[PDB]
């Protein structure tokens, strides 16, 4: 490759040397996509080798098998695993695909053409050709729209998706008539991210999920056609920066946003991340402990409507600030939790006393007890329970692991966006290397700072 | 051509001739920060007692309610609200807005927006001055820590009542409750963070002493040595190669920074990356990943548990734990 | 300790974001040669910025 | 300690501030 003398970029910034080498840049990308597909397949095979069927998947440290099972592979009613073969198929398909992608990346990085414009002008681009760059962006929006419509097809006609809101405790369901109402779909988008609203984390049914996917697939395809058939308008030219580093910084800000929202999805959402596969959510575990001890103290002959706590505010039932009946104790902070084993027990006034008394279900109470014993609190040695516990439970929730790692990645990628937005701005300006030392702008300004 | 009203306002905002730069990040930073400053000062002076725990007992927190500067603290939002957005206009009156912890959630939201736009304004002034732009990146580490303790920990735990109270003894309370619940001391990210402030102090003392130890003689003994430097001079005011020689034969000849830009890069990057790691540690412990758990790790041949230093740490943790929320628990597991 | 870690980070960042050019290369670490009688960074620019 | 603390704080404000003001006014007098 190149060195410091020929490029001005040191080894620890070596990829910048291939900013303006289109073929080598393509090779780096294809080899990287080979790595992502490779990790997906290799870790999928590792998980299905280390998978155990008499345990739920949140107890074995699994992050990809829950993702496959949410699509409706190898699981049936109750979220119980029936076949590890679809998971095996996904793993091996990804591993072979990564072999092909890795060959493409290695070829284009090592012996591929250095720059693509002199021989392949269709793929030839420079970072200032806005027409070509929007063409590439449009191609990729059609690709992502086909991915979203692929999920739409999977939910509509190819076995459906796992619905944790199905009666009985969750089952794979063919989605029929997804919501196409723009008001309902974009109300999630313009929603506040605070409690009770949660922005788009509070999507709670696959009807909304698949409808938003229809919507986003169609917008992606339309915007892809639009970007192929247009060029950015003069206001966009005057506002944006048009360097490859600038496009990188825009992508970094957007994927940092995606990482933060993915953290909050994994932590709070239970319809795209069913608790049968991922373990209970944070609110789910505390509400579960309250609900279990409520039914045990009904079985031990006591009235739970009465019997105020040590503060006189209610041991088992109390009032939320908005007026409904919620579980007492500190779990009142999680009073806005919504799950499959509380909604059949919830009336218009929140929790209904007579329904809590008579219309209990055994599957709901064992689900609640199992969610109580498997709360997302553990150590990074994978020692379940709070920091004061004993090394006796080897368990940390996949929700914990996913939310943790993806907040870390989203934050570092926001910082990378900062770095690259600044470097792209200063590079377009001309002082990415420093001040002129003879035409320093600070010496030309007035005194007194 | 410079005639239009938006032109006059725009060139005033981007003007580098103002005593304090405003800029486009400043048009957000200034009003949010004055909002947070005004509410923080008024609340610290005379905020009525705030019910932090959700159990109908408030913590006073304000000087006019008998608190001194060390104790006084803007007490977090109530536990009953949770992560619900609680503006003044949402509350029935200002008085119960105060009692449920409204000033805290207001000041924290405005402080978030203020520090984010302070970072943007730092980048902006460096762009307008022909500078290199990464002071915003270096400032992103205390911003990361502020977000981690004021918003990210409340999101992970489920209520702004778990945020850091805006005060001194309230901060100490946050640290003690946090160690009780998550074992921050045994978390590797907090170890990197502690190493970051200890190293920042170490290399700050080292850089300052090596530069002061090599200042070129220009003044007399009866004048401040600082008077040997005039603002805007182009000469090097200290002997960099002599300080290198001293440092090399003091620690390692070859493992010493022979480049001043290398030395300043290490100075910039070491505490910044370590504060990034400790801010992310607080974020990890928001989602309950917790520190190292070595409680009853060591056992004998009979299987009998040998107490260790981590076990004494754990006994201290149980002491801290059985006192936080003395009346707010109804259930044995602390899942909230 | 907190102010000293602040001083470490802020001094390093200020020096490296007020560097003079001396360049002809995208890496700035090689624009420094330690046997010179000239400053590497603009104390004036740093003072104005802060 | 309610009025003894007040006079302690008062003297701690006044004596070093007065000393510093001596020195600063002396300096700014001579240009």
């Amino acid at each position: 490759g190149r060195d410091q003398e020929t490029t001005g970029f040191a080894w620890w910034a070596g990829n910048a040397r291939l900013i303006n080498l289109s073929g080598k840049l393509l090779g780096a990308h294809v080899a990287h996509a080979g790595l992502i597909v490779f990790w997906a397949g290799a870790m999928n095979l590792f998980e299905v080798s280390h998978f155990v069927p008499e345990k739920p998947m949140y107890e074995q440290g699994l992050i990809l098998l829950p993702h496959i099972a949410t699509l409706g592979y190898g699981v049936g009613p109750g979220g119980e695993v029936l076949d590890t073969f679809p998971y095996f198929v996904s793993g091996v398909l990804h591993l072979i695909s990564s072999a092909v992608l890795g060959f493409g990346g290695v070829y284009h990085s090592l012996i591929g053409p250095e720059t693509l414009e002199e021989s392949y002008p269709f793929f030839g681009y420079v970072w200032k050709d806005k027409n070509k760059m929007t063409n590439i962006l449009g191609y990729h929006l059609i690709i992502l729209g086909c991915g979203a419509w692929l999920l739409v097809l999977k939910a509509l006609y190819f076995g459906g998706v796992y619905d944790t809101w199905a009666p009985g405790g969750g089952d794979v369901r063919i989605i029929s008539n997804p919501t196409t109402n723009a008001a309902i779909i974009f109300g999630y988008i313009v929603k506040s991210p605070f409690g009770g609203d949660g922005w788009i984390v509070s999507v709670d049914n696959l009807e909304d999920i698949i409808g938003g996917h229809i919507w986003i697939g169609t917008l992606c395809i339309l915007g892809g056609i639009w970007h192929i058939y247009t060029t950015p308008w003069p206001w966009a030219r005057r506002a944006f920066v048009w360097s490859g580093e600038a496009y990188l910084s825009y992508s970094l800000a957007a994927v940092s946003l995606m990482g933060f929202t993915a953290c909050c999805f994994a932590w709070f959402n239970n319809t795209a991340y069913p608790s049968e596969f991922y373990g209970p959510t944070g609110p789910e575990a505390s509400q579960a402990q309250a609900f279990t001890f409520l039914v045990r103290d009904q079985r031990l002959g006591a009235n739970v409507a009465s019997a105020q706590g040590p503060t006189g505010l209610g041991k088992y039932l109390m009032r939320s600030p908005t007026g409904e009946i919620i579980f007492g104790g500190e779990t009142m902070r999680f009073w806005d939790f919504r799950g499959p084993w509380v909604e059949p027990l919830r009336g218009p006034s929140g929790l209904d006393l007579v329904k809590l008394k008579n219309d209990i279900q055994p599957w709901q109470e064992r689900r609640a007890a199992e969610y109580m014993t498997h709360a997302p609190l553990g150590s990074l040695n994978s020692v379940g329970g709070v920091a004061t516990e004993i090394n006796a439970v080897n368990f940390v929730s996949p929700r914990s692991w996913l939310a943790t790692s993806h907040f870390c990645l989203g934050f570092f990628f926001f910082v990378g966006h900062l770095w690259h937005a600044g470097r792209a701005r200063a590079a377009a300006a001309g002082f990415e290397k420093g001040i002129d030392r003879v035409d320093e702008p600070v010496l030309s300004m007035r005194p007194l700072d | 051509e410079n005639t239009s009203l938006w032109a006059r306002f725009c060139e005033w905002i981007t003007s580098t001739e103002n005593r304090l730069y405003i800029g486009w990040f400043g048009v957000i930073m200034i009003p949010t920060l004055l909002t947070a400053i005004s509410v923080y000062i008024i609340a610290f002076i005379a905020a009525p007692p705030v019910d932090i725990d959700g159990i109908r007992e408030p913590v006073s927190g304000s000087l006019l309610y008998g608190n001194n500067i060390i104790t006084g603290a803007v007490v977090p939002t109530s536990n009953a609200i949770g992560l619900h957005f609680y503006p003044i206009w949402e509350a029935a009156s200002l008085d119960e807005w105060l009692y449920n912890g409204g000033p805290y959630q207001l000041v924290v939201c405005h402080f978030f927006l203020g520090v984010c736009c302070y970072m943007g304004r730092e980048w902006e002034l460096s762009y307008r001055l022909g500078m290199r732009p990464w002071i915003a990146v270096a400032y992103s580490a205390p911003v990361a820590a502020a977000t981690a303790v004021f918003i990210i920990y409340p999101i992970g735990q489920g209520s702004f009542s778990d945020g850091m109270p805006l005060g001194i003894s309230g901060t100490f309370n946050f640290m003690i409750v946090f160690q009780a619940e998550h074992n921050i001391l045994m978390h590797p990210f907090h170890m990197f963070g502690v190493a970051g402030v200890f190293g920042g102090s170490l290399f700050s003392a080292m850089h300052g002493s090596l530069v002061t130890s090599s200042l070129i003689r220009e003044t007399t003994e009866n004048e401040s040595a600082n008077a040997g430097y005039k603002f805007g001079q182009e000469e090097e005011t200290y002997n960099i190669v002599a300080a290198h020689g001293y440092f090399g034969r003091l620690i390692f000849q070859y493992a010493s920074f022979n480049n001043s830009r290398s030395l300043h890069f290490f100075l910039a990057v070491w505490p910044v990356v370590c504060i990034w790691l400790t801010a992310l540690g607080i974020s990890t412990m928001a989602f309950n990943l917790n520190g190292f758990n070595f409680n009853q790790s060591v056992v004998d041949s009979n299987g009998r548990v040998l107490n260790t230093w981590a076990d004494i740490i754990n006994r201290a943790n149980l002491g801290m734990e059985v006192m936080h929320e003395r009346n707010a628990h109804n259930f044995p597991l602390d899942l909230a | 300790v907190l102010g000293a870690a602040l001083l470490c980070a802020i001094h390093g960042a200020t020096v490296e974001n007020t560097l003079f050019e001396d360049g002809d290369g995208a890496n700035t670490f090689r624009a420094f040669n330690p046997t010179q009688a000239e400053e590497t960074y603009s104390m004036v620019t740093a003072n104005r910025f802060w | 300690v309610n009025i003894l603390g007040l006079t302690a704080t008062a003297l701690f404000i006044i004596i070093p501030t007065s000393f510093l003001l001596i020195l600063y006014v002396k300096t700014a007098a001579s240009e």
Partner: peptide, 30 residues
């Protein structure tokens, strides 16, 4: 009565900050 003294000390420090920002010795650049 202590609160008066605390408020005095705090706004006194704030006044010191105001004066040190807006009434400083300017950099002479000579």
């Amino acid at each position: 009565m202590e609160a008066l003294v605390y408020t005095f000390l705090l706004i006194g420090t704030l006044g010191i900050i105001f004066f040190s920002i807006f009434f400083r010795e300017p950099p002479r650049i000579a």
